Each structure stands twice: as structure tokens, then as C-alpha cells.
């Protein structure tokens, strides 16, 4: 297995991509501490991976809860090799014009506290452990960190902010801790309480690869960055992992639909 | 005079680069409304430019104050052609490890509310006027929106966020309103930080930082904004990001500039 | 006028964007030396701008012809302030699969010699003059220098290559000569002899600005970079000038078609 | 073994990073065809890996030789899953002013034919096989494809060109074939240049260049390529660009790394 003996801490790991990552990492022989809000989903995850996962109930916006998570990971598993700050909330792609005046302030805080501050706090909480292990941080970004229309101004700003975290923390924590970003997109899939695309169009206009991958197919990039001995030269790296959103064509996403007949293959 | 008849609103326009922009825009024949926290400095520019600049004291973090700045601009000059969200605060380049646990949450809010939310609220406030005029938004970013070591994680993350606002708002406001970013660097402004946060002068590290090999006066950074404010010149530009930082992103490994030996190598 | 007393040298200035630039620069009070292949179109341009333009007949692929151009500019006008290497040929957006085996080598040379080598030679020829004047270089790139589907692999590679020239030459020629790039796209409009989009689709899917600007509307960015006192802090700068191609949405180019009604404005 | 049953073709695979890739891919259970100019070194890897690696002597600039390498791969192993166009030559970091007028045209062709055209011809040669296998192209770029001072204008322009090939070919080959770039830096390979062209060792400038603060062994750069060759792990990736250069693009102004004082600051 790719990650035998490795210890990772994954925030927002009780569901979504984060849970797919927990499952993958454990299958790869890793031990995994998860910080998330749902006590029930966390206990379910602990039992699913008996002895290879530990769940910490808490608020990713709270430095104290991030520190509780780091501490619990160290208590259960003895070290932290790879930190994966991953918890994020969306903004329904709500356009600036559609953000009501009486909710915009609250919404700003909700989404930024989770998507950016929670990442800052995760890294802050885990810094002693990561320096000790000469480990690494793998941020979950998004296509919204690079291109428009993957979210409203709030979500897009937060994910661009994370690209800034990749760069500044790769600098600040060098030479001791490496810091990289995976920017998934085109996956299967919740926004703040203050706020409230067809597959055909998705395959034709958005995704050159011509299909929406299952969540599990997005876990491999994180295994790569977490693998002992495969990512040593990488810091400040940004891996767009979104089906080709940034390289899509003007009239169609892909240019090569006819190749198989074109090449008589 | 390249901006005759045009009207700009500039946030943080009473000091630093913002004030240089006010003077340049008035000099180019624009009328300018300014939102800023300094009453004294708003008075100074009002006296300097007479009726061609109007100031409004307020907090860039407040949508209400942003709406009052827009309302005032409309009352004074009848339209808004170019909005320059420009007000920003620094973080003293405070490293993550150096952000104290009891100050970090407040510092986050202070810097994000000014640098990111205040940009959002300025556009929100001016959107009706800007759609009416088929106008422009020129965001002030920073070298810190592209490269590390121009601020700590808080500042660097805010200016990266502003790059996101250029991209997303260029998309959301098209085809009516053009949205672009200028990213100044090497300005040597007095980088004010938040009260919650309690380094090497530019001159002292110049040859490690700026390929241009010199420290531009503030006036030297106003030309990029005039370009984006000039409808006959910048019509194709939206979603553009203009690094304007003396070459920080193209600096060499051992020294910033590669052409120290150029003139002797070519004689003359 | 914006450019009074300034001297520019523009390669590929006899037609297309290059001619629009000649015309604009002269209107702005600049003196302009033009290197191009057509003797007739050059003489026509000289007479159009009597005393403010000089035409040098030559091959942009030839260092000796680029040097002849620099020399003629100096002879006529006394200095070179701004060099604008701009001559380029297209590849018909010919896909790799459609490039015939017996023409690909020749085509590679044709397009690279013009689009990249001609730029290298222009800068090389003008280097003494530009260092003397503490001037600048403004490369014509293309949206093809940043995104796919603005050309085939040949044209796209050449224009990405030019981005490399912007970066390396901004470095190499600092602190004496500044080097920046304008990347136009969405304009009105020839490829190599070895080789051989609807407006509705262009406005809806490609161009957020929702219209194809006239060539003259692409000249302003070059005036900016050539203006004495407006671009001093800029070197290694890249100005995407393509109607928003890089910031286009997934299902439509623009997100704000409804704003005027939405805002009751 | 992460690549059991897969077949790779690697150009320039008989030395440097290319040979490290061959060894890693065989170690991961792939079979590998190599196109390279060194007959001796192709023999060395053939003996090393027995029947799991086959070499073909040839010129990466020649489409004919690229087609012969593909044909050979097919004859040996029955398919091509991953193509790694990797062969490149450097330019001694020769500055523009230092390119002699009588050598510059030849140098241009030599470096562009190898670094750019040879990449084009490798994909052209392997396209039928890659479309058949719904395979992958992993281009070797360089830090010189993103930042200055990693080569002269010739090399820097070629590796920037290769970034264009990642983008354009990701588009043209979708949805069947995925195309991505790895951009290694800090490798300390013996950067061979063209005969037409007649500097500071990495170790000597490390703290101005590499935030990671150490000089990776060649084997350390093979992991990114394995990832792109692993169908179960990299399926969503196309058009991606992975800088793999010890942090060259996130290096600080005064020193490459920002965390010299980190461990003392946190105790333990």
C-alpha cells in the first residue's frame, strides 16, 4: 500500500471528498485523524476504520478545536505527517447582484471563516507536529480558485485566497514543511444559513474529459502528495484536477471527439 | 487630458497611492469622489482640486458608507464611470507562527473586512451607476496577490482573494462593466496594519527585489489606472491582471536584474 | 498627444494590427520605423504619414534585416524608444492530427522562425538603441499564448514561447530596458505555404464583452506601454487584451446580461 | 507496484531524469520503450531491466525515428498507455547579448527542434496508440517554462512553448487522451547544449534558489510521472501543470526559505 505508517489529519473528513479521502488513505495503510462537526458521522467513520481513524468533534473555524484535533492525532497515532485542510462551504454561486444587502456581511464571515480562516488555523494548530515530522500540507482548493463561474464572488474569493495560502505558507514553512494545493472540480458536490448545471452541458461545454468522475477518482492526487518519497521536490505546487476546465475549447470543451475514426483506430 | 468628462470613485483615496490616483485623474480631466477614513486628508484634496474632487469620510468595511460615497458621487457629478476599490491594510508581514493565538481571529476579520469585503461592498454600492455608464472597475491588488513574501499569510491571502474578485466580477458584470486588476509593488507606502497586531526597508534590499533597479515615485503607478479608465484605449480589457511591481515576478536567482554587464557588453 | 517625441519600431506594421498601431502611434505624435515584407504597402504607409514613418523592406526572420531596420530608424529619427515585435503568422488552427507528416517539419520552421525567432532578432538588433534610450519592448502575444483553441499546436506553442521571451528578456535586460507583453484576441484577423467561428458563437461563448472590437480599439494598450512616464514600474507584465476569454463562463461567456433590468437601471 | 501491466514510451530515457523514469516505471511494473541517441546507454538499461525495457536509437527531432520508437513499443508490448516526451537540450544560460550573430540562427533550430518539435513528433507518432488505449501524455517541462534565469531566451522560450503544448494538446486530444506537464527544477542534470553555442553550480547558490533547502536526488522527481501514469489516481487531470522545482516560484526576496527560525520559535 502507498501510505503504510503515514499519519494524516483531514478537516471536513466526515462527508464529501473529505470522507472519500479518509477511506482512501486508510485503504492505503494510513492512520487518519478527522476534525468535523458531526459527532454521529465521526463515530460511524471511526467504526468503519477501527484503529486507523480517530474522530474529533469540533468547529474548523476554531483554533482551539484545530489544536484539540492535532493533540488527539498525536495522542492516538504519535505524529502528523500530512495535514489536509479541506473543510469548505459553498455560496450557491450567488452573484454579487443577488447577495442581499442585509445578509452579505454575515455571509462573508461564514464562508471566509470556514474556507480561509479554518485553513489558517489547521496549519497553525499542526505546525509543531509538521515541523517535527518534516511533513506537508495539502490544501483542498477548487476550480473556483483559478477560474470564474465555479461559485459567486464569495466562494471564488475564498478559494483564490487559498492559493495565496499555498504560496505564502510554502515560503514561510520552508525548509521544514512542504505546502501544496489540489484543486478539484467537476465532482458530484451546502452553503451558509444567511444565503439561499445539466450533465449534458457539463460534458459538452465544461469538462474536456467528457464525464463527471466519482469522488473516489479525486483521491489519488492527495495520495500522491502524501506518499513518502514521491513529492519531496514539491512545494508551492498547484495541481488543477478538474477534468480540464482551464483547457476547455471555445465552442466545445474537447477538440478530439473524432480522433478514433480520424485515426482509423 | 485623457479623461475629460469622466467620473471616478476611489476608495482609500486620501493618502498613499489612492491620493496619487486622485491627483492624476483630476489632472487628466476626470472628476473624482473619494471614500476615506481621514477627514483631514479628505479636506486637503478637496481644497487642492476645488470642485473637481469631493470627499466622503467613512469606513470602507461598511456597505452603508460605500453606498453613501456612491450617492455623493452621483449628487456631485451625475454618474460613475470608473470605480477604483483601492483601500487596503497590511499585516506587518507577520508570519503564521508569529500570529498570537489570542489576536489571530480579530486580525483575520480586520484585514479581510478591509481588503476583501470592502472591495465587494464598493462594487455592490456602485453597481447600478456602473451598469448605467457601462463603466469599469479597477481593483488595486499587490505583488502579494501573486507571490509570497510581500505580506504574511493574512495579507497575502486577501490580495490573492482580490485576484478572484477580478476574475469572478469580470464574468458577472460582463458585457456591461469591465473589471481588471492593477498589482502594484515596490511602492514604499507606509503599510498600516490592524490594531490587533501590536522588517527590511525596500531601499536596503532593492537588488534582491526589483529588476527595474530603482524605486518608483507613487505618481509612476497612476498610468495603469488611467489606461483602464480610458474607454477609447481599454475596451477589449476585462479580467486582466497587470503586475506593476518593478519586475518582482521575473527577478533572477542571485540578483534581481540580469543586465548589470549589458552596457559595457554593447559599448557606446 | 500621448507620444510626442517618442520613436517606435514596429515589425509587421504594413497591415493588420501592426498598421493600426503605426497609424495610432503617428496620430499620438510618435515617429515610427516599420519592418515588413511588402515594399508597396510600406511606401503607401510612408506617404500616409509623411515624415513620421519610415519603411524598411525586409524579412523579420533575418537578423541582418532587423539590424537594417534598427539602423534606418536611428538614421531617420535618432533613437529607438519602444520596440514592438509584432509580425506573426497563423496556422489555420490546424490540429496535430491534421498536420500532414510531410509538411509538419517545414511548417514548424516557418511559424517558429517568424513568431519566435523574428522576435528574438528584433530585440537583438535594437538592443544598443534600447539600452541607450532606456526604452522598452512590447511584444504582441495572443490569447493563444495563454489558452488553447486560438490556434493549432504550432501557433499556440509559438505564442506561449513569446511569454517566455517576455519573462527572460525582462530579467536579462533589466535594469536598462523594460520588457512587457500585450496579448490581443477577438480581433478581425494568413499562414505558411506548407499548410492549408460564427459571430453569434463568438459573442455568446467566447467573448464576455459581447462584441468584436475594431482593430483600432486594440492600439491603446500599446500607447500605454509606450507612454513616457506611465509604465515605468512595469517589466515582465502580461496584459490579456482579448475581450475576457480567460474569464468566460461555462455555459455563456458573460454572467451579467440581465443586470440592467435586474438593477432597474 | 502501482503500474502493473501498463506500457510507457519515454524519449531521452537513457540518461538523466529520463533514465530515472525508466527505472522507476519498471520498478512499478510497467514495461518501457525508450527513444534515445545513446546506443551504449540504451544497451545499459536493456541489460538492467531485461525484457521489461526495449531501447531504440534515434533522433528525437525526426518524426520517422519517433514513429520507429512507437512501432517498436507496439511490437514489444502491444500498446502504449503513457508517452513521456522528455528529451531536451539546454542553452548554457547564454544571454541574448551573448548569442553570436553567426551562430544564433543554428542554435535556435537545434534547441527548438529538440525541445519543442521533438515533443510534437513524439505525440504525433504515438497518437493512434494513445487514442486506442485512452492513454496519457506527460511532458517534461522545466522551471524555465514558468520563470526566468533557468536558461537563456532560447531555452526559456522552448519550455514556455511546451506549456502551450500541454494546454493545446489537452484540448485537442480530449476526451480520449489526458495531457499534463511536470516541470522539474533543481535536478542538477548535466545540461547539454547545442554544438553551435561553443555558470554557478546549484550547490553554490542553493539558499537563493530552493526553499526546500536541499538538492533532491533524480529518483525524487519520478513520483509525479508515476501519478500521471496511474489511471485509477489521475483520471480527472488534464491540462495540469505541476511545478516540481523545490519551490522556485514561491521563494522569498532575501533568502529562498522563510522558516529558518521556525523550529526554535516552536521549541521541541
Swiss-Prot record, chains A, C:
Subunit annotation: Homotetramer.
Family to which the UniProt record says this protein belongs: Belongs to the short-chain dehydrogenases/reductases (SDR) family.
UniProt protein name: Cis-2,3-dihydrobiphenyl-2,3-diol dehydrogenase
Class of this enzyme: oxidoreductase
InterPro entries named in the record: BphB-like_SDR (IPR047950), BphB_TodD (IPR017711), NAD(P)-bd_dom_sf (IPR036291), Sc_DH/Rdtase_CS (IPR020904), SDR_fam (IPR002347)
Active site per UniProt: 155 (proton acceptor)
Family matches, as Gene3D superfamilies: NAD(P)-binding Rossmann-like Domain
Coiled-coil zones: none
SUPFAM superfamilies: NAD(P)-binding Rossmann-fold domains
Gene behind this protein: bphB
Binding positions for NAD(+) per the UniProt entry: 10-34
Domain of life: Bacteria
Keyword Lipid biosynthesis applies: no
